Every structure is written in structure tokens, then in C-alpha cells.
Amino acid sequence: VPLMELSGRAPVVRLHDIEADMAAATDAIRSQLTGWGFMAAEVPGIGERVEAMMNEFAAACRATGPSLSDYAYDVVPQLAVGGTHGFFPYKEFIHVSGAMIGDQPGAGDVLRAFPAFGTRAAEVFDIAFRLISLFGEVVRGMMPPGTPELDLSHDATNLRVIHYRHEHSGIQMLGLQLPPSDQGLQYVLHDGTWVEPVIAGTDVVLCAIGRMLTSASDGRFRPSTHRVHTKRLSSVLFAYPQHKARQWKMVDGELMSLNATWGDFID
Ligand SMILES: [Fe+3]
């Protein structure tokens, strides 16, 4: 599989000028989606933060004292309506939702128990959520006039961090892949050929179309199907709208509100 270099080629988006750099990068981002099926930006400083976070997750996964499995999803308080956050033991991974970061109560205890990791995760979540919200404003701008705002939900969005680890797409609106520890993640182009973005140990983030946005755009943007081939840590933000909010579609240029909710889409 061919390597796809993105350092020095994707638009630069600085941590302290995110909104204005993403405005400048709009046309480049639109042409990536048009021409590749996924999106990319280089965020100087992000890799340093993500590496520290992943390395602290790996140390936490080996904690014999307060253990991460003390915060397995089935012993963590969950929202009545929403996804499942917390730790998923063994390949082993954690879902840090925006609700968790706001302690929505006891749900935040895994971050009090592992606060070095938890502080990085909250920081990376905040950066990733601002980026991914602006990626969604770009995609909205490519859709017909009268397309609603994506209304990504802080609380319903989660950051996944994976320790030990087939072609697939996310079910959510957008995914933002953060620089992994190792190469192996691969994306398919519009012509069915696979590329391996060069992202391990970089500052490059990849933004993926998920199936909710494929549906909301009525198939205009295919999901950014991807896979992982190995020769290990990784994190990705999964952005969701409010589960109880009403589905919509832009069908043939015209806005349709459906009865089904975004929660129903997941089920
Ligand atoms: Fe994925």
C-alpha cells in the first residue's frame, strides 16, 4: 500500500488560532473531501500532547493499585440517554465522553483516579472537539443552502484511547483520528485504492466522514472507510449530535425533518 505524506502538505492549523486557521484552510479541506474522501490538517504541538496522553494511558492500563477496570463501563454511572463511557477491558480502551469530563456524578472518577492521564485527555478532547466542529462547518458549507448546523454535542462526543490495537466506518457524524503511536491505519480513496497516511509521530489529524453525515447528506459524502494493518496506541474523537435530537436529511436540495432521532439511527 502506498504511503501518503501529509506533513508539510496539509493546511497548518495553530493551537491558538484554530478558528481563523480553519477558515483559511477551508478551500484545501473542501478539496480533500472532494478528492480523497477524508480530510487532514497539521496542528503543530498536537502530537506531543497526544503522545503523552497515550503513554499515560498505557501506564494506567498496567496499574495494579486503583485499576482502570475499577472504571469499567458496567460499574461507571451512565447517562439515561446516550452512549456508554468508561473503560473496556480486554483490544483494551477507554471512552472519555464530554459528559464524563463534566462528571455527568461519579462518571468523572476514572479521571480523578488517573488525573495525569485524565488531564491530558480533557485537554486533547477540547482541542479535538473544536477542530472537529470546524471541520463540520466546512462540510456543511459544501451542502445545499438551508442545511442545518450539525449541532455536535459536547456531552455525547467521546474520545477513545486504545492500547493493544477490517474495513469499517464510524456510525457517528465525524471522526477525528489523532496521531497514533505506529503506522498502519489506512484509508480508501474514491477509486477503491488504499493509502497509508503518514501520521505516526506527526502533528497531522485526519477527519473522517461517519454514517450519520452520509445519511444527513443523503449519500453525497460516503463514509471515510478505513482499516488497520500492523507490521501500539491510538486515539480518535467520535463526534455525535444530541441523541434525542431529530434526524434530518438534505434530499435533492430540500430539508427534511424526520420523526426518528439520532439515537434511533444508532439502534
Ligand atoms: Fe475507526
Short mmCIF file of C-alpha atoms and ligand atoms in Angstrom, two decimals:
data_model
loop_
_atom_site.label_atom_id
_atom_site.label_comp_id
_atom_site.label_asym_id
_atom_site.label_seq_id
_atom_site.Cartn_x
_atom_site.Cartn_y
_atom_site.Cartn_z
CA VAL A 1 0.00 0.00 0.00
CA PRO A 2 1.35 3.44 -0.97
CA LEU A 3 2.37 5.90 1.71
CA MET A 4 0.61 9.27 1.66
CA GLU A 5 2.73 12.07 3.11
CA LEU A 6 0.84 14.86 4.84
CA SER A 7 3.44 16.67 6.97
CA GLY A 8 4.23 19.89 5.12
CA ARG A 9 1.38 19.34 2.65
CA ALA A 10 -1.86 19.56 4.68
CA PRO A 11 -3.04 23.01 5.81
CA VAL A 12 -1.48 24.25 9.06
CA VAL A 13 -3.86 24.98 11.95
CA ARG A 14 -2.26 26.50 15.07
CA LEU A 15 -3.49 25.66 18.56
CA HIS A 16 -4.07 29.32 19.49
CA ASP A 17 -5.64 30.42 16.19
CA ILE A 18 -7.86 27.43 15.46
CA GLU A 19 -10.93 29.31 14.22
CA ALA A 20 -9.03 31.59 11.83
CA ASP A 21 -6.62 28.95 10.52
CA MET A 22 -9.57 26.64 9.77
CA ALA A 23 -11.21 29.50 7.87
CA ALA A 24 -8.02 29.90 5.84
CA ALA A 25 -7.84 26.13 5.28
CA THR A 26 -11.47 25.84 4.16
CA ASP A 27 -10.79 25.52 0.43
CA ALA A 28 -7.98 23.00 0.94
CA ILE A 29 -10.24 20.96 3.24
CA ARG A 30 -13.14 21.00 0.76
CA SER A 31 -10.80 19.76 -1.94
CA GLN A 32 -9.50 16.94 0.28
CA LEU A 33 -13.03 15.71 0.92
CA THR A 34 -13.88 16.07 -2.79
CA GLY A 35 -10.65 14.44 -3.94
CA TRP A 36 -9.86 11.84 -1.24
CA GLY A 37 -13.00 11.18 0.81
CA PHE A 38 -11.33 12.25 4.07
CA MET A 39 -9.68 15.41 5.43
CA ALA A 40 -6.41 16.34 7.09
CA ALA A 41 -4.72 19.18 8.91
CA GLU A 42 -1.36 19.65 10.61
CA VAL A 43 -1.70 21.06 14.14
CA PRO A 44 1.75 22.00 15.48
CA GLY A 45 2.03 20.79 19.04
CA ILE A 46 -0.82 18.24 18.94
CA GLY A 47 1.43 15.19 18.63
CA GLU A 48 3.39 15.98 21.80
CA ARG A 49 0.13 16.21 23.75
CA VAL A 50 -1.38 13.05 22.22
CA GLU A 51 1.80 11.01 22.77
CA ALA A 52 1.96 12.00 26.44
CA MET A 53 -1.73 11.13 26.84
CA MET A 54 -1.36 7.73 25.15
CA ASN A 55 1.78 6.91 27.13
CA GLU A 56 -0.01 7.77 30.36
CA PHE A 57 -2.96 5.60 29.28
CA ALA A 58 -0.55 2.69 28.73
CA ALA A 59 0.94 3.10 32.20
CA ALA A 60 -2.56 3.30 33.69
CA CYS A 61 -3.51 0.07 31.89
CA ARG A 62 -0.83 -1.73 33.96
CA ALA A 63 -1.87 -0.17 37.32
CA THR A 64 -2.11 -2.98 39.95
CA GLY A 65 -3.38 -0.45 42.55
CA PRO A 66 -6.54 1.67 41.70
CA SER A 67 -7.02 -0.23 38.39
CA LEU A 68 -8.65 1.08 35.18
CA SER A 69 -11.06 -1.86 35.38
CA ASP A 70 -12.40 -0.27 38.59
CA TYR A 71 -13.97 2.09 35.99
CA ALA A 72 -15.19 -0.49 33.50
CA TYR A 73 -18.32 0.76 31.77
CA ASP A 74 -20.62 -1.53 33.73
CA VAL A 75 -19.58 -0.05 37.10
CA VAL A 76 -19.45 3.57 35.87
CA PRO A 77 -22.62 5.72 36.11
CA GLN A 78 -24.05 6.10 32.61
CA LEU A 79 -26.42 8.68 31.17
CA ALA A 80 -30.05 7.58 30.89
CA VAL A 81 -30.00 8.58 27.20
CA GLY A 82 -26.69 8.27 25.41
CA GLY A 83 -23.72 6.10 24.65
CA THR A 84 -21.59 4.13 27.08
CA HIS A 85 -18.46 5.72 28.57
CA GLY A 86 -15.71 4.29 30.74
CA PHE A 87 -13.13 1.53 30.40
CA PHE A 88 -13.49 -1.56 28.17
CA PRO A 89 -11.14 -4.31 29.42
CA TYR A 90 -9.59 -7.00 27.23
CA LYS A 91 -8.11 -4.51 22.48
CA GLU A 92 -8.41 -2.55 25.72
CA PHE A 93 -9.65 1.01 25.50
CA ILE A 94 -11.47 3.83 27.25
CA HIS A 95 -14.31 6.11 26.14
CA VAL A 96 -13.92 9.56 27.69
CA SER A 97 -17.17 11.36 26.90
CA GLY A 98 -17.76 15.08 27.31
CA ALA A 99 -20.32 14.12 29.98
CA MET A 100 -17.60 12.25 31.89
CA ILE A 101 -15.31 15.29 31.76
CA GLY A 102 -18.13 17.28 33.36
CA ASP A 103 -18.70 14.45 35.93
CA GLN A 104 -22.09 13.60 34.48
CA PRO A 105 -21.83 12.37 39.01
CA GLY A 106 -19.18 9.77 39.69
CA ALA A 107 -18.74 9.30 35.95
CA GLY A 108 -15.63 11.51 36.31
CA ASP A 109 -13.99 9.25 38.91
CA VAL A 110 -11.73 7.44 36.42
CA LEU A 111 -10.19 10.86 35.68
CA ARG A 112 -9.74 11.63 39.40
CA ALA A 113 -8.15 8.18 39.85
CA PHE A 114 -5.81 8.70 36.88
CA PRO A 115 -5.53 12.52 36.81
CA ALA A 116 -2.28 12.75 34.86
CA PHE A 117 -3.89 10.81 32.01
CA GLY A 118 -7.25 12.45 32.72
CA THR A 119 -5.83 15.98 32.43
CA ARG A 120 -4.26 15.22 29.03
CA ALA A 121 -7.46 13.53 27.84
CA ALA A 122 -9.60 16.55 28.77
CA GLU A 123 -7.11 18.84 27.01
CA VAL A 124 -6.97 16.69 23.86
CA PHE A 125 -10.78 16.32 23.91
CA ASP A 126 -11.20 20.12 23.98
CA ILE A 127 -8.76 20.70 21.11
CA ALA A 128 -10.19 17.82 19.08
CA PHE A 129 -13.77 18.94 19.62
CA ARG A 130 -13.02 22.49 18.47
CA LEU A 131 -11.22 21.16 15.39
CA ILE A 132 -13.91 18.63 14.50
CA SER A 133 -16.69 21.21 14.93
CA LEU A 134 -14.95 23.44 12.41
CA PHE A 135 -14.41 20.51 10.04
CA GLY A 136 -18.17 20.01 10.21
CA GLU A 137 -18.78 23.67 9.39
CA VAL A 138 -16.62 23.15 6.29
CA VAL A 139 -18.64 20.09 5.25
CA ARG A 140 -21.90 21.95 5.91
CA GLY A 141 -20.66 24.70 3.60
CA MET A 142 -20.39 22.15 0.78
CA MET A 143 -24.03 21.06 1.23
CA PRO A 144 -27.08 22.82 -0.28
CA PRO A 145 -28.29 26.16 1.14
CA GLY A 146 -30.56 25.77 4.12
CA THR A 147 -28.53 22.85 5.52
CA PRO A 148 -28.89 22.98 9.32
CA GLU A 149 -25.94 23.31 11.64
CA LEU A 150 -24.51 19.92 12.56
CA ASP A 151 -25.11 20.65 16.28
CA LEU A 152 -22.35 18.36 17.54
CA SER A 153 -22.91 17.66 21.22
CA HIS A 154 -20.04 18.10 23.67
CA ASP A 155 -21.58 15.67 26.17
CA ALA A 156 -22.43 12.98 23.58
CA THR A 157 -18.98 13.11 21.92
CA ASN A 158 -16.24 10.86 23.20
CA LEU A 159 -12.51 10.47 22.94
CA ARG A 160 -11.44 6.86 22.61
CA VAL A 161 -7.91 5.81 23.58
CA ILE A 162 -6.87 2.29 22.54
CA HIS A 163 -3.99 0.25 23.90
CA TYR A 164 -3.26 -3.10 22.23
CA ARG A 165 -4.69 -2.21 18.76
CA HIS A 166 -11.07 -4.82 8.99
CA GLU A 167 -12.59 -2.20 6.65
CA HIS A 168 -15.18 -0.12 8.54
CA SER A 169 -16.73 3.32 9.01
CA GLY A 170 -17.90 5.08 12.14
CA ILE A 171 -21.61 5.36 12.85
CA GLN A 172 -21.30 8.95 14.12
CA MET A 173 -21.22 12.30 12.29
CA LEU A 174 -17.46 12.83 12.15
CA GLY A 175 -14.35 11.12 13.47
CA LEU A 176 -11.03 12.85 14.11
CA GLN A 177 -8.08 10.47 14.15
CA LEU A 178 -5.21 11.76 16.23
CA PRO A 179 -1.58 10.82 15.53
CA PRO A 180 -1.11 7.19 16.59
CA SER A 181 1.99 5.62 18.04
CA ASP A 182 2.53 3.41 14.98
CA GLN A 183 1.83 3.27 11.27
CA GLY A 184 -0.88 1.01 9.95
CA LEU A 185 -4.10 2.97 9.67
CA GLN A 186 -5.25 3.05 6.05
CA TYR A 187 -7.98 4.87 4.14
CA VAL A 188 -9.65 4.04 0.84
CA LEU A 189 -9.83 6.61 -1.96
CA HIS A 190 -12.85 7.24 -4.19
CA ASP A 191 -11.40 4.88 -6.81
CA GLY A 192 -11.15 1.93 -4.39
CA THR A 193 -7.38 2.06 -3.87
CA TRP A 194 -5.98 2.10 -0.33
CA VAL A 195 -3.44 4.58 1.02
CA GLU A 196 -1.49 4.63 4.30
CA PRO A 197 -1.35 8.22 5.63
CA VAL A 198 1.98 9.02 7.29
CA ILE A 199 0.73 10.14 10.70
CA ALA A 200 2.55 8.15 13.39
CA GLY A 201 4.59 10.57 15.48
CA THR A 202 3.42 13.61 13.47
CA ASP A 203 1.18 16.61 14.13
CA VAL A 204 -1.35 15.54 11.45
CA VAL A 205 -5.00 14.86 12.33
CA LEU A 206 -7.37 13.09 9.92
CA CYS A 207 -11.09 13.90 9.88
CA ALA A 208 -13.43 11.07 8.79
CA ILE A 209 -16.97 11.22 7.45
CA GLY A 210 -19.25 8.98 9.51
CA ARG A 211 -22.51 7.30 8.53
CA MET A 212 -24.75 9.85 10.28
CA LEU A 213 -23.33 12.53 7.98
CA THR A 214 -23.62 10.21 4.98
CA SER A 215 -27.30 9.88 5.87
CA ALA A 216 -27.78 13.59 6.65
CA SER A 217 -26.13 14.48 3.34
CA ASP A 218 -28.24 11.76 1.61
CA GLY A 219 -25.21 9.83 0.34
CA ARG A 220 -23.34 12.87 -1.04
CA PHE A 221 -20.38 12.16 1.28
CA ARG A 222 -19.52 8.47 1.59
CA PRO A 223 -18.19 7.31 4.98
CA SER A 224 -14.40 7.60 5.24
CA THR A 225 -13.92 3.83 5.29
CA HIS A 226 -10.64 2.76 6.85
CA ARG A 227 -8.80 -0.25 8.27
CA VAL A 228 -5.72 -1.04 10.37
CA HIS A 229 -2.82 -3.18 9.14
CA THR A 230 0.04 -3.90 11.55
CA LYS A 231 3.68 -4.89 10.97
CA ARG A 232 0.82 0.18 19.87
CA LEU A 233 -1.52 3.05 20.94
CA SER A 234 -4.13 5.20 19.23
CA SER A 235 -6.85 7.74 19.93
CA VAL A 236 -9.78 9.12 18.00
CA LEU A 237 -12.59 11.56 18.74
CA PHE A 238 -16.11 10.40 17.77
CA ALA A 239 -18.45 13.39 17.39
CA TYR A 240 -22.21 12.92 17.84
CA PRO A 241 -25.20 15.25 17.85
CA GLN A 242 -27.71 15.00 20.67
CA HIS A 243 -29.21 11.51 20.76
CA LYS A 244 -32.74 12.84 21.38
CA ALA A 245 -32.47 15.35 18.54
CA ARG A 246 -34.46 14.82 15.35
CA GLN A 247 -32.83 13.32 12.28
CA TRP A 248 -32.70 15.41 9.14
CA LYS A 249 -31.71 14.92 5.51
CA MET A 250 -30.96 17.20 2.57
CA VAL A 251 -32.78 15.24 -0.16
CA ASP A 252 -32.36 16.81 -3.61
CA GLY A 253 -31.58 20.24 -2.18
CA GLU A 254 -34.55 20.34 0.24
CA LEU A 255 -34.52 19.92 4.02
CA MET A 256 -36.49 17.05 5.58
CA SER A 257 -37.07 16.63 9.28
CA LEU A 258 -37.71 13.01 10.20
CA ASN A 259 -39.53 11.55 13.18
CA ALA A 260 -36.61 9.28 14.06
CA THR A 261 -33.96 10.69 16.40
CA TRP A 262 -30.20 10.41 16.07
CA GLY A 263 -30.45 7.85 18.86
CA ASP A 264 -32.73 5.76 16.63
CA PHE A 265 -30.12 5.93 13.87
CA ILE A 266 -27.63 4.17 16.16
CA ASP A 267 -30.10 1.37 17.07
FE FE B 1 -12.22 3.68 13.17
#
